[PDB]
Design a protein around this ligand. Sequence first.
Ligand SMILES: Nc1ncnc2c1ncn2[C@@H]1O[C@H](COP(=O)(O)OP(=O)(O)O)[C@@H](O)[C@H]1O
Ligand SMILES: [Mg+2]
Length: 234
Amino acid sequence: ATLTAKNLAKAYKGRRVVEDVSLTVNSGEIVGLLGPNGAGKTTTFYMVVGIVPRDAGNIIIDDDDISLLPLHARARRGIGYLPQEASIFRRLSVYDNLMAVLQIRDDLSAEQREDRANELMEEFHIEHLRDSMGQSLSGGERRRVEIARALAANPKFILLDEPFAGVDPISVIDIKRIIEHLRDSGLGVLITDHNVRETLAVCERAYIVSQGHLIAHGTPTEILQDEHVKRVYL
Ligand SMILES: Nc1ncnc2c1ncn2[C@@H]1O[C@H](COP(=O)(O)OP(=O)(O)O)[C@@H](O)[C@H]1O
Ligand SMILES: [Mg+2]
């Protein structure tokens, strides 16, 4: 499957924070959208997911333009999303967090939803935290639960908005491996970060954004040697 954004634009009070942004992510690859804080990464994700109105542009899955589809319909079509900010239910256990999201799985019986929660806990290395309250978890643990929550909806594409934010250096290793596993499983992964080198290493290719504009695309080695990229990190 293919998810494409074309000519996305968004302004706040006239300030153009995303301008003429186009990108593609296909099943089975990890694609980066990388650039400094404020570059427009989250805003771009918002327009793809359906969280904020776009000022311009199109969202396309395969042959179908889904620009007019509400958030819930785009999700059904395969768009999954991990917010940058905390999204876990802090008062609820890991298990209850997962079961809450799994209630949207009308294709599964109640027992099958329970089965899926157990599978997800094992896959994300959080099954030992089944009954732990979200509030009690470390940043890294919470992030694993949040990614599991995103996956519970069975998406084709997963937009990870800074999955390493608030995660200790140690926990980052496992999350990277989980993300690599997602790609291996056939998910299309679009991942944001301000730490270019760290996240680039796990990308097959990446777009670099600066002040609302795409300035470069390529493999990690191409990006690290691109003068247009160097030019904004002087
Ligand atoms: N609701 C809003 N009103 C005004 N400005 C906003 C709003 N949301 C985001 N912005 C601005 O848009 C710019 C891009 O934000 P964002 O897309 O979150 O950047 P990034 O995720 O790349 O750090 C930021 O400078 C931010 O101040
Ligand atoms: Mg952001």
